[PDB]
């Protein structure tokens, strides 16, 4: 009797976390119940600029909602590219993994202080964080750095409720110039294991596929 659990239905339809809304281009990849609970999405694509699907994943705000775009590649935050529902981190202090981790740790500790570095009034809800491009952050040192990266993103989701979307290039980028450097991307399981959905875009017809 003491152990009986009776839950109001309103518990099962209410969440403290934001979830990713897959665009039509990515529907039919996962279950119905699975899409309902998408918190971490990684996309692998060859495009330097964001593919249309990625563009749709972001710029998905409404009203006070904002997405934090950590623009390592200096694309999203270009003046001709900025959108109203985004906040941008594009800084020389955040184009390597050490600086990135420092910023995200500050965002977790003191969102106001971190967000002030993105030149933001705080009358809004932070819905998501996007990091583009993880391939630019690339022995066992990276497994540890990427594990640390994933752990801080997960803490941020727990505290702030934001979803997380990250992008990397396919393996062909890792071959290097003239193959001199020689999942279909080169990120540690330490990171990839944490993703709810991993999507791979192979192009003249671009096809989005689940991994």
């Amino acid at each position: 009797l003491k152990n009986i659990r009776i839950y109001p239905l309103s518990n099962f339809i209410t969440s403290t976390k934001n979830y990713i809304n897959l665009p039509n281009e990515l529907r039919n990849l996962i279950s119905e119940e699975q899409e309902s609970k998408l918190g971490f999405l990684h996309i692998i694509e060859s495009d330097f600029k964001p593919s249309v699907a990625l563009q749709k994943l972001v710029n998905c705000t409404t009203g006070d909602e904002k997405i934090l775009i950590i623009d390592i590649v200096s694309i999203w935050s270009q003046q001709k590219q900025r959108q109203h529902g985004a906040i941008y981190m594009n800084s020389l202090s955040c184009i390597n993994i050490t600086g990135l981790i420092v910023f995200l740790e500050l965002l977790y500790d003191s969102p106001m202080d971190a967000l002030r570095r993105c030149q933001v009034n705080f009358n809004f809800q932070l819905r998501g964080i996007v990091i583009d491009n993880l391939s630019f952050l690339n022995d066992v040192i990276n497994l540890s750095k990427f594990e640390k990266l994933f752990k801080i993103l997960r803490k941020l989701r727990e505290f702030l409720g934001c979803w997380i979307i990250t992008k990397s290039f396919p393996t062909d980028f890792y071959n290097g110039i003239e193959n001199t450097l020689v999942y279909p991307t080169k990120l540690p399981d330490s990171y990839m294991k944490g993703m709810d959905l991993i999507i791979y875009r192979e192009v003249g017809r671009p096809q989005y596929r689940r991994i």
């Binding site: 330097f48 590649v73 184009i95 110039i177 003239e178 020689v182």
Partner: protein, 193 residues
């Protein structure tokens, strides 16, 4: 091609000497701004002869143009990294001094594939790629700065033959990307013919 229309990083395949000269002339001639050309080359091949013909130093309206062109010979990625440091110092101080007219810098780099090759033989593939990456990402962030007192835009020259991926996409056996193709795919905003 006007400065205001330049992307953060642009590839210019095999420009003719006359077109390069005219580009420089039109941009450094803009009134109400100070436009500078930093020409960084691995082969010391600024077309001085053609430039003097099209932009005679003996004409008054041309003096400032010559004064605002800076020439450097750069043999490897380590030297290019140092040059980027110097440019960022210039930009940072201009921005600071601008409140203690506007500066427009065109960074023009020829022979980046040979600088890369040189570095690669003196160090490693991994180190050369990381130095290339670090330098290009930095130049993008620099060019992307919203500041209106000082700006930079980067142009990278490559021979058309190093960009077959681009031309054939128009619409050959190959062992990976040339440096030009790698940059075209992963670092440059656009390519202008």
């Amino acid at each position: 091609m006007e400065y205001e229309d330049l992307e953060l990083i642009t590839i210019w395949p095999s420009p003719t000497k006359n077109k390069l000269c005219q580009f420089i002339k039109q941009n450094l001639s803009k009134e109400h701004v100070v436009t500078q050309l930093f020409f960084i080359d691995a082969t010391s091949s600024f077309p001085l002869s053609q430039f003097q013909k099209l932009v005679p130093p003996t004409l008054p309206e041309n003096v400032r143009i010559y004064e605002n062109i800076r020439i450097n010979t750069c043999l490897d990625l380590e030297e290019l990294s140092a040059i980027t440091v110097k440019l960022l110092q210039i930009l940072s101080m201009n921005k600071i001094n601008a409140q203690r007219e506007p500066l427009k810098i065109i960074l023009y780099i020829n022979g980046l594939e040979v600088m890369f090759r040189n570095s690669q033989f003196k160090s490693s593939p991994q180190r050369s790629h990381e130095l290339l990456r670090d330098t290009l990402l930095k130049l993008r962030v620099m060019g992307n700065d919203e500041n209106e007192n000082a700006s930079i835009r980067t142009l990278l020259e490559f021979p058309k033959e190093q960009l077959l991926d681009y031309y054939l996409k128009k619409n050959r056996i190959k062992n990976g990307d040339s440096l030009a193709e790698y940059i075209w795919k992963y670092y440059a905003d656009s390519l202008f013919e």
